[PDB]
């Protein structure tokens with residue numbers, strides 16, 4: 020197996036996105052997330068195995084492949100850039116939130132550093148885009164983007180849920196611009212639904228979006244992504260919401276996620292037959308996250324095994340991008356497990372006794388609804 024065919028993407032640029040209040044306590048999407056992962060990668064000796072990349076900033080045009088021109092100018096530029104903008108744009112920017120902590124924000128959760136946040140978000144997006152292009156051209160086999168802020172909640176003209184630009188959706192669009200007719204699968208295992216991603220590709224049959232998320236009948240952030248949302252127009256059938264219902268008791272964990280993969284993720288993905296796979300790889304379904312931030316128990320090995328299964332797709336062209344997840348030990352274990360798998364380490368499903376347990380009933384039920392709905396569109400889902 021070829022050396023240096025797995026890319027890692029990281030840069031200290033992305034650390035500077037911090038509220039001016041200097042308190043990681045009230046801001047869970049903090050710089051420590053990526054830095055703790057980065058060093059773990061070095062320590063366990065994986066970094067040296069990978070083509071390491073710095074990333075770069077997304078251009079305003081790359082941004083506009085997903086987001087509106089006004090969103091891009093709001094979050095993609097600074098006062099007062101050396102940017103050549105016409106006075107009409109400059110004036111629009113003159114026409115236009117205080118946080119409890121005294122920092123500036125877009126909303127309560129979503130903080131804005133007036134010096135650094137625009138650079139860090141553009142850098143997250145450009146880095147996933149670049150790590151991906153390498154895989155698409157096939158100079159690399161797969162890879163992992165250690166990026167923040169996250170992306171999957173940002174829609175055409177909305178920043179929310181810690182996110183400003185949808186780095187994954189942007190990479191997806193860029194890829195497709197450069198290889199005509201290519202088919203892209205986005206798998207989003209962050210515990211939250213990637214509303215911006217679903218919306219971006221909702222009427223687009225060239226992209227298959229599969230989200231697994233805690234849903235609980237419309238009652239978990241962001242409240243979107245019910246099982247019956249299958250896509251529209253041309254793209255009807257190409258949006259798959261594995262919407263987990265029923266809450267926190269019983270325990271949602273490895274047997275459920277493994278079962279989701281066996282029954283839904285993998286068979287639909289093989290039927291679709293993607294040219295490349297992007298992963299919105301949040302780790303907030305990991306053990307370590309309290310009720311309001313997750314409440315699930317997926318383990319690092321399971322994230323590892325899920326990565327390994329997706330490598331059987333697309334000739335192996337797999338790109339992960341960090342989304343959510345804030346327990347440092349939990350996200351470091353998960354990331355390690357994922358990077359090992361990317362390199363071609365194999366997880367032994369027999370090694371775990373807890374993986375002999377049947378999925379819980381809320382899980383089986385949730386999957387029944389996915390199968391019921393998607394039978395109309397997918398052969399593997401039929402009868």
Ligand SMILES: CC(/C=C/C(=O)NO)=C\[C@@H](C)C(=O)c1ccc(N(C)C)cc1
Pocket residue numbers: 044045046047128169171172180181209211240301303311312342343344
């Ligand atoms: C935005 C988001 C997750 C995003 C994500 O993970 N990307 O998908 C979670 C919000 C709604 C939330 O529930 C919350 C809970 C506790 C808290 N503290 C008091 C630490 C701050 C925020």
Ligand SMILES: [K+]
Pocket residue numbers: 207208209210211212213230231232
């Ligand atoms: K998700």
Ligand SMILES: [K+]
Pocket residue numbers: 220221222223224225226227228250254257258
């Ligand atoms: K689609």
Ligand SMILES: [Zn+2]
Pocket residue numbers: 038039040041042045046118120121122130
């Ligand atoms: Zn603050």
Ligand SMILES: [Zn+2]
Pocket residue numbers: 209210211301303342343344
């Ligand atoms: Zn999340």
